[PDB]
Amino acid sequence: ATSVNERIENKRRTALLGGGQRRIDAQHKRGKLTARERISLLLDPGSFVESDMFVEHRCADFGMAADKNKFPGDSVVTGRGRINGRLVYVFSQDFTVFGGSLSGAHAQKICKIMDQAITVGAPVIGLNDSGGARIQEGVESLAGYADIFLRNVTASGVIPQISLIMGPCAGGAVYSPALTDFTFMVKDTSYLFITGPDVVKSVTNEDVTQEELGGAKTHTTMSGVAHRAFENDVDALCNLRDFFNYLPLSSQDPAPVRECH
Amino acid sequence: DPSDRLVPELDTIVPLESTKAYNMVDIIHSVVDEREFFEIMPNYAKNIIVGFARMNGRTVGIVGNQPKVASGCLDINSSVKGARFVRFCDAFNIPLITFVDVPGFLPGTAQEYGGIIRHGAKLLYAFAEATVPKVTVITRKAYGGAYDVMSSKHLCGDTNYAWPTAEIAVMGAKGAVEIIFKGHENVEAAQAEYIEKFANPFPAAVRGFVDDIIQPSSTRARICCDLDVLASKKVQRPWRKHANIPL
Amino acid sequence: DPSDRLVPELDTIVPLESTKAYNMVDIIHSVVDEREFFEIMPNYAKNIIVGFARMNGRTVGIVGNQPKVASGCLDINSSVKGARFVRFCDAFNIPLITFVDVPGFLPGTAQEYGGIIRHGAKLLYAFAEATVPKVTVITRKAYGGAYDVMSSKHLCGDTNYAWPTAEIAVMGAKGAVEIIFKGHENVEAAQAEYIEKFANPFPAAVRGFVDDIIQPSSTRARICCDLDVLASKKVQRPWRKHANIPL
Amino acid sequence: GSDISIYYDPMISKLITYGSDRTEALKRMADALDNYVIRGVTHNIALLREVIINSRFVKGDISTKFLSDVYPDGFKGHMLTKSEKNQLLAIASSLFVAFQLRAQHFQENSRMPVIKPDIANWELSVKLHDKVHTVVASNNGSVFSV
Ligand SMILES: CCC(=O)SCCNC(=O)CCNC(=O)[C@H](O)C(C)(C)COP(=O)(O)OP(=O)(O)OC[C@H]1O[C@@H](n2cnc3c(N)ncnc32)[C@H](O)[C@@H]1OP(=O)(O)O
Ligand SMILES: *C(=O)CCCC[C@@H]1SC[C@@H]2NC(=O)N[C@@H]21
């Protein structure tokens, strides 16, 4: 009689929900979906293979060693799937767990999935919804950001990289989408700024809202950072799925050719 | 969609007078497969149109000027938006089709103080280093250095076409006669000869700057065949770690 | 043989107690296509099994530990045989599937005088330099450096799985408690904690050293898909005439 | 390529059908009016099609105020029946499934082979007007069971 077998599905259930049902309800109330259902809506049915399901952060300072702060998965879902039968490597950030903040394990999973994608020669798709670097981790978050930036630069021109911002992305989390090939946004629910409105008001003495400072309209109309903005989450996933069919899987392949009528 | 489909509604889309504008998205829809066009940055720098479409089932990148917005002039935002898209298309073996209708660059002190030269160089370099097949169609006009920036034949372009309404000129007729004929004080005839001799695609076609002058209704059938023969295009360039983008 | 053929017979093939042994060739037969397996050196160094099989019609090289004889411990002959087979499989673009159930290298002065270190280095190099896709499944245990020598994830492995009855540790609980806990002079709480927290595959999973913990009945269906993705794997290494095998 | 301007009459065209009797003429009018393609402007083909297949028009009793009284509030369109609604939903679902299936027909790569999905039945939610319908579509070639 061993409890490890029970612990398997115990941690599986804790990972599937993420950071709890209450935060999922809050996410739905905000008009946004969770990472897992976003992935299910993006990929072909019955084709998602997830990697590093049981990975937790290594932080042991400032109370993060407590059992209540240990979430299996660590605010990111990473894996591979297929769109219209074509292989793709996908990661989606989970705002439920610590606001999507990137810890050491988060960046480790992203770097691993990017490394596998660049080894096999497949595109990378990232659903971005994160509050920035995790302060509790410390310089580990900066190291993870730098590793992701280095992999983004190395993979530039080798495999296509698509980033879809689906929430308020602040701080370092804004540089990775800028290094990717294309940037898409969701109206009224996605933001992209380096510093928040409070810091702007405190420093520059100016009143500005989140939507005005880094909203989808601002970045798709007068900034030139994002490429397209979509009505909501489902429309964004549908349009991204349609757009993925245009691009080749790698720079070693010719332009895709389809059937004409 | 058949590759040799005729597209007759483009025969008179370009107005006879040069002071009236049209929509380039109409031409793009009429030319591409099933009239389906995934436009990139549709609400930013509207005086240029970039996007992804399909020709004979093969994905292609479309870059064009928009005479409806800002008379089709080029500026900083349009230059950057076109340049990055062209660079991405070249990087992943995606053919490029360009539609040219531009009077030049947008003048003013705001453009000069913002660094219009750097971004124009960005766009010119983006079209210059491309090794993917490039097909260019001139609809109404291409004046001055913009004609070079819009994937001319001399940038190692593959095929260049001009509609009967095309006007490949150094600059505007009035400025040309005012800089050539200074003391002639008889511009009344000079306008007649200059318009009759240089306000047409003939100066460019007489020296092979455009492959042919094609009827608009045969545009699509002209492009697809080219994309059939240029799929095996392969050129070589001097070795380097990388180049110096004018960012 | 369908690529998603479920294999429930592997659900309870691993005995609960760690002192009972099972047959590794049963897992090989149940996993591979049509249960056909061409073994190499079946009667020499029988604590390891190597051979050729087919997965989804593609030829695969299979190396695994046999816990029936010598409890699966590695030695000179086993290391040499496995290293040679792995080198041949890597040299001819044949993917490798590894099944890991090993407690380490068996002790004795005959192994030390014969050069067990050199042959362990043989096999470690053989898995280290391989650039073919490698799929590793840990069945029961992987203790100490042998776990590294058996195509671990850190050794440029492609995909690593662990069964729910797997366990990865530096060595057994007894030696670890003896070398760590000496001043407590009590094993009532130390042994219980070590068994409950370091006698299960969770330390390897939480650090990300195994991709997933899978049910045994989904083994084959899991491997085939991995062999479909990893077909186009390509890596680059520094130039050299050759390397020094520790022969 | 022809354009409609504010200066002249809005007359797009003049369609005529001839048959042995009135019923054949009306059938030919319907057939030729369903196969007439205009894209770019707004036409009154819907009004003509609804008027032609009108029961009162078929019977014969018409007057100069025939258009005024049959649509007191105004023109609304074709009030399609239950069978026609089912046919329209089936056609739309089949077209959607056909587009989705065509989206998967890539050329052979020889380096990254594709694995075409094997969806047997497509389960769809179709919103028409202000009603949601559940549709199950299956394909076995050029034939769709909806
Ligand atoms: C430049 C390189 C770097 O180091 S960037 C580091 C990030 N810098 C910052 O200033 C963080 C600012 N974050 C924010 O302002 C908000 O969280 C934003 C991102 C605007 C979210 O907006 P909103 O939709 O209202 O959600 P919320 O504020 O209720 O947040 C809910 C939970 O998320 C958490 N969260 C968010 N970010 C972090 C973070 N970096 N580290 C740790 N936790 C974070 C919040 O603590 C919050 O927790 P709780 O559920 O309210 O208890
Ligand atoms: C105006 O540009 C068109 C002249 C033809 C219409 C004239 S005027 C009104 C009459 N009614 C009709 O159908 N033709 C006549």
**DSSP class per residue in A74-92:** -SEEEEEEEETTEEEEEEE
In this structure, the strands spanning C48-55 and C38-40 are: antiparallel
Give the residue from C174, C182, C178 showing the smallest Cα distance to C143: C174
- From the CB coordinates, do chains B and C have 3 or more pairs under 8 Å? no
Interatomic CA distance for residues C112 and D130, integer angstroms: 82
Signed CA dihedral, A135, A138, A142, A143: sign only: negative
Task: For residue B40, give the nearest of A157, A228, A247 by CB distance.
Answer: A228
| Minimum-distance ligand 1 atom for the alpha carbon of A23 | 50
Beta bridge partners of residue B53, listed in sequence order: B60
Question: To 10 degrees, the CA torsion angle through D81, D83, D88, D93?
Answer: 140
Chosen for mutation from B1, B7, B9 (greatest number of chain D CBs closer than 10 Å) is B9
Interatomic CA distance for residues A189 and A167, integer angstroms: 6
Q: Residue B151 burial by CB count (10 A; 0-12/13-18/19+): exposed, middle or buried? A: buried
The tokens of A81 are what?
């799937």
> How many C-beta atoms surround the C-beta of residue C201 within 10 A?
24
Give the residue from C127, C144, C100, C137 showing the smallest Cα distance to C212: C137
Distance of CA D9 to the CA centre of its chain: 28
Q: In B199-238, where do the E strands start and end? A: 212-213
Q: Residue B66 burial by CB count (10 A; 0-12/13-18/19+): exposed, middle or buried? A: buried
Chosen for mutation from B59, B119, B232 (greatest number of chain A CBs closer than 10 Å) is B59
In angstroms, the separation between the Cα of residue B12 and the nearest Cα of chain D is 7
- Output the ligand 2 site: residues, CB below 6 A: D 8-9
Question: To 10 degrees, the CA torsion angle through C172, C173, C174, C178?
Answer: 110
CB contact under 8 A, D112 and A45: no
Q: Determine whether the shortest distance from the Cβ of A133 to ligand 1 is under 6 A.
A: yes
Interatomic CA distance for residues A65 and C182, integer angstroms: 27
At B98, which amino acid appears?
T
CA dist list (Å): D15 to B79, B132, C4, D29:
50, 49, 61, 8
Q: Determine whether the shortest distance from the Cβ of A219 to ligand 1 is under 6 A.
A: no
Alpha helices in A81-209 (DSSP H): 104-120, 139-155, 175-179, 197-204
> How many C-beta atoms surround the C-beta of residue C18 within 10 A?
16
Interatomic CA distance for residues C157 and C203, integer angstroms: 18
Task: For residue A224, give the nearest of B3, B80, B231 by CB distance.
Answer: B80
Name the residue with the closest Cα to ligand 2, atom 11.
D9
Give the residue from B68, B56, B69 showing the smallest Cα distance to B135: B56
- Pocket mutation for ligand 1, best pick of A101, A200, A202 (most atoms within 8 Å of C-beta): A101
Q: Are A245 and B62 in contact (CB under 8 A)?
A: no
Give the residue from A127, A156, A141, A172 showing the smallest Cα distance to A64: A141
B20 CA → ligand 2 middle, Å: 29
Phi, psi values for residue B205, rounded to 5°: -75, -25
Give the chain A residue whose CA is nearest to the CA of B32: A260
Q: Which residues contact C48 (CB under 8 A, 6 or more apart)?
A: C63, C64, C65, C66, C74, C78, C81, C82
Q: Residue A103 burial by CB count (10 A; 0-12/13-18/19+): exposed, middle or buried? A: buried
The tokens of A75 are what?
């605010």
Interatomic CA distance for residues B151 and C223, integer angstroms: 50
Beta bridge partners of residue D138, listed in sequence order: D121, D145
CB contact under 8 A, D112 and C232: yes
> Hey, is C230 helix, strand or coil?
helix
Q: Are A174 and A154 in contact (CB under 8 A)?
A: no
Chain A hits for B231, Cβ within 8 Å: 254
> How many C-beta atoms surround the C-beta of residue D101 within 10 A?
15
Signed CA dihedral, B63, B68, B73, B76: sign only: negative
A165 CA → ligand 2 middle, Å: 57
Interatomic CA distance for residues C243 and B100, integer angstroms: 58
Give the residue from C190, C136, C189, C125 showing the smallest Cα distance to C166: C136
Beta bridge partners of residue C169, listed in sequence order: C143
The tokens of A193 are what?
């700024």
Concatenating the DSSP letter of every residue in D47-113 gives HHHHHHT-HHHHH----TTHHHHHSSS--------HHHHHHHHHHHHHHHHHHHHHTT-PPP-SSS-
Using the Cβ of D1 and the Cβ atoms of chain B, whether some distance falls under 8 Å is answered with: yes
Q: Determine whether the shortest distance from the Cβ of A174 to ligand 1 is under 6 A.
A: no
Give the residue from B51, B101, B28 showing the smallest Cα distance to B71: B101
Signed CA dihedral, A177, A181, A186, A191: sign only: positive
Phi, psi values for residue A79, rounded to 5°: 180, -165
In angstroms, the separation between the Cα of residue D106 and the nearest Cα of chain C is 18
Chain D hits for A121, Cβ within 8 Å: 111-112
Question: To 10 degrees, the CA torsion angle through A243, A245, A248, A249?
Answer: 100
Chosen for mutation from D112, D119, D142 (greatest number of chain A CBs closer than 10 Å) is D112
Q: Which residues contact B221 (CB under 8 A, 6 or more apart)?
A: B3, B4, B5, B6
Task: For residue B93, give the nearest of A182, A255, A259 by CB distance.
Answer: A255
CB contact under 8 A, C164 and A112: no
Q: Please tell me what DSSP assigns to residue C110.
A: H
Give the chain A residue whose CA is nearest to the CA of C198: A4
Task: For residue A120, give the nearest of C205, C208, C233 by CB distance.
Answer: C233
Upper half-sphere CA count for residue D25 (Cβ side, 13 Å): 11
In angstroms, the separation between the Cα of residue D74 and the nearest Cα of chain A is 34
Q: Are C211 and A52 in contact (CB under 8 A)?
A: yes
> How many C-beta atoms surround the C-beta of residue D28 within 10 A?
15
Report chain D's C-alpha Rg in angstroms: 22
Q: Are A42 and A81 in contact (CB under 8 A)?
A: yes
Taking chain D, what is the end-to-end CA distance rounded to the nearest angstrom? 39
In this structure, the strands spanning B212-213 and B168-169 are: unpaired
Chain D hits for C231, Cβ within 8 Å: 113
Give the residue from B45, B41, B9, B44 showing the smallest Cα distance to B27: B9
Give the residue from A178, A218, A213, A207 showing the smallest Cα distance to A193: A213
Name the residue with the closest Cα to ligand 2, atom 7.
D9
List all chains that touch chain A, counting a touch as 3 or more CB pairs closer than 8 Å.
Answer: B, C, D
Interatomic CA distance for residues D134 and D146, integer angstroms: 10
Q: Please tell me what DSSP assigns to residue B107.
A: P
Using the Cβ of A255 and the Cβ atoms of chain D, whether some distance falls under 8 Å is answered with: no
Smallest-distance ligand from the CA of A135: 1
Give the residue from A90, A154, A144 showing the smallest Cα distance to A122: A90
Signed CA dihedral, B13, B14, B16, B19: sign only: positive
Give the residue from C193, C214, C239, C247 showing the smallest Cα distance to C11: C214
At A151, which amino acid appears?
R
- From the CB coordinates, do chains A and B have 3 or more pairs under 8 Å? yes
Interatomic CA distance for residues D22 and D102, integer angstroms: 43
The tokens of A97 are what?
């767990």
Interatomic CA distance for residues A84 and D112, integer angstroms: 13
Signed CA dihedral, D6, D8, D9, D13: sign only: negative
Which positions in chain C have a beta carbon within 8 angstroms of at least one beta carbon in chain D?
Answer: 228, 231-232
Helix axis angle, C173-180 relative to C190-198, nearest 10°?
Answer: 130
Resolution limit in angstroms?
A: 2.8
Which positions in chain A have a beta carbon within 8 angstroms of at least one beta carbon in chain C?
Answer: 2-5, 7-8, 11, 49-56, 72, 80, 87, 105, 108-109, 112, 119-121
Encode D104-126: b = buried (16+ Cβ within 10 Å), e = exposed: bebeebeebebeebebeebebee
In angstroms, the separation between the Cα of residue D117 and the nearest Cα of chain A is 6
The tokens of B163 are what?
């509609």
Residue owning tokens 């219209």? A84
Using the Cβ of B191 and the Cβ atoms of chain A, whether some distance falls under 8 Å is answered with: no
Smallest-distance ligand from the CA of D5: 2
> Hey, is D127 helix, strand or coil?
strand
Chain B hits for D1, Cβ within 8 Å: 8-13
CA dist list (Å): A249 to A64, B95, B107, B236, C224:
40, 16, 42, 24, 21
The tokens of A259 are what?
């059937």
Alpha helices in A80-138 (DSSP H): 104-120
Interatomic CA distance for residues B172 and B107, integer angstroms: 14
Q: Are B165 and B140 in contact (CB under 8 A)?
A: yes
CB contact under 8 A, A122 and D112: yes
Interatomic CA distance for residues D44 and D38, integer angstroms: 11
Residue owning tokens 């937790």? A56
Give the residue from A256, A157, A241 showing the smallest Cα distance to B59: A256
Q: Are C24 and C101 in contact (CB under 8 A)?
A: yes
Smallest-distance ligand from the CA of A140: 1
> Hey, is A22 helix, strand or coil?
helix
At B144, which amino acid appears?
G
The tokens of A133 are what?
């670097």
Interatomic CA distance for residues B89 and B58, integer angstroms: 13
Residue B137: in which H helix or E strand, if any?
strand B134-143
Give the residue from C57, C48, C143, C146 showing the smallest Cα distance to C95: C57
Using the Cβ of C4 and the Cβ atoms of chain A, whether some distance falls under 8 Å is answered with: no
CA dist list (Å): A79 to A99, A188, B145:
21, 28, 49
Interatomic CA distance for residues B55 and B230, integer angstroms: 13
